[PDB]
Amino acid sequence: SMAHGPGALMLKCVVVGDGAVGKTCLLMSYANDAFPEEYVPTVFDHYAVSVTVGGKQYLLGLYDTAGQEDYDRLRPLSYPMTDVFLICFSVVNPASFQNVKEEWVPELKEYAPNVPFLLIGTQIDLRDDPKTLARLNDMKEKPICVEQGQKLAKEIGACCYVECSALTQKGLKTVFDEAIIAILTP
Ligand SMILES: Nc1nc2c(ncn2[C@@H]2O[C@H](COP(=O)(O)OP(=O)(O)NP(=O)(O)O)[C@@H](O)[C@H]2O)c(=O)[nH]1
Ligand SMILES: [Mg+2]
Numbered sequence: 001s002m003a004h005g006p007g008a009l010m011l012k013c014v015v016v017g018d019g020a021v022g023k024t025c026l027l028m029s030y031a032n033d034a035f036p037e038e039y040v041p042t043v044f045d046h047y048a049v050s051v052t053v054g055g056k057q058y059l060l061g062l063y064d065t066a067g068q069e070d071y072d073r074l075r076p077l078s079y080p081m082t083d084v085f086l087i088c089f090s091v092v093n094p095a096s097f098q099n100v101k102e103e104w105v106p107e108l109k110e111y112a113p114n115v116p117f118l119l120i121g122t123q124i125d126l127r128d129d130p131k132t133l134a135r136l137n138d139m140k141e142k143p144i145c146v147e148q149g150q151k152l153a154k155e156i157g158a159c160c161y162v163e164c165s166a167l168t169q170k171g172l173k174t175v176f177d178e179a180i181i182a183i184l185t186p
Contacts, residue, residue: 006057010048013179014063014078016104017088018096022122022166026088027064029166030176042066051176053184060180076111083183085117086175091144091163092126092136097152105156116182118160119153120175121146125165159185 001007015023027044028036044064051058063078065071087104089096100119108117126132127143136142146163153161159182164171 008050008057008059010059010061011083011180011183012061012063012081013084013086014065014082015086015088016065016107017067018093018099019068021067021088021090021093021096023067023088024064025166026122026164026172027062029169030172031062033169035167051180053180058180060176079111082112082115084179085112085115086120086179087117087158088120088122090123091121092123092132094141094144097144097148100152101156116159118162118179118182119149119156119158121149121161121163123165124163124170125167
């Protein structure tokens with residue numbers, strides 16, 4: 001190794017889900033072990049981190065994707081040779097939860113048929129924020145709870161349900177550990 005540093009098998013994880021569920025922030029927060037305080041992009045640059053699985057090392061490549069409608073056309077460009085997807089919804093946006101079964105799961109079933117994926121509930125620090133709960137209880141909506149995520153993950157055939165907050169980093173480690181296990185599960 002005079003020409004280059006440590007190297008390793010590269011794996012590819014792509015993140016999909018609704019506008020404003022926290023995909024980008026989930027990725028920047030995992031990568032930098034801090035919530036992005038400065039300027040947050042629509043889409044985070046391709047980025048990888050080293051992990052140590054079962055005494056073997058791997059580079060987990062992290063691909064972000066926009067969930068709006070300007071970025072519809074070009075999104076499936078990210079999908080080829082993916083090893084695992086994360087389908088994110090925000091536990092304080094029920095509408096994104098209903099878009100799992102009805103928008104993100106069909107898209108994956110059409111383009112990466114036999115690629116495993118997880119179901120990730122995001123922004124769980126808002127689940128009991130006074131300001132948020134009340135904005136929600138204006139529409140007699142309430143936050144998605146843990147039991148609803150687990151149930152939904154089974155129906156759709158996700159490998160599991162994991163929750164996190166990008167803000168405090170709770171659950172983040174588990175999200176990506178489980179993405180790896182789901183891949184390295186021969
Ligand atoms: N409190 C809290 N806010 C969060 C969290 N994650 C993201 N946010 C906030 O949620 C908003 C959108 O975040 P973002 O990561 O851009 O979501 P996105 O899914 O990437 N959006 P897009 O599809 O358009 O790229 C921002 O105001 C951001 O600060 C979280 O875990 N907790
Ligand atoms: Mg994004």
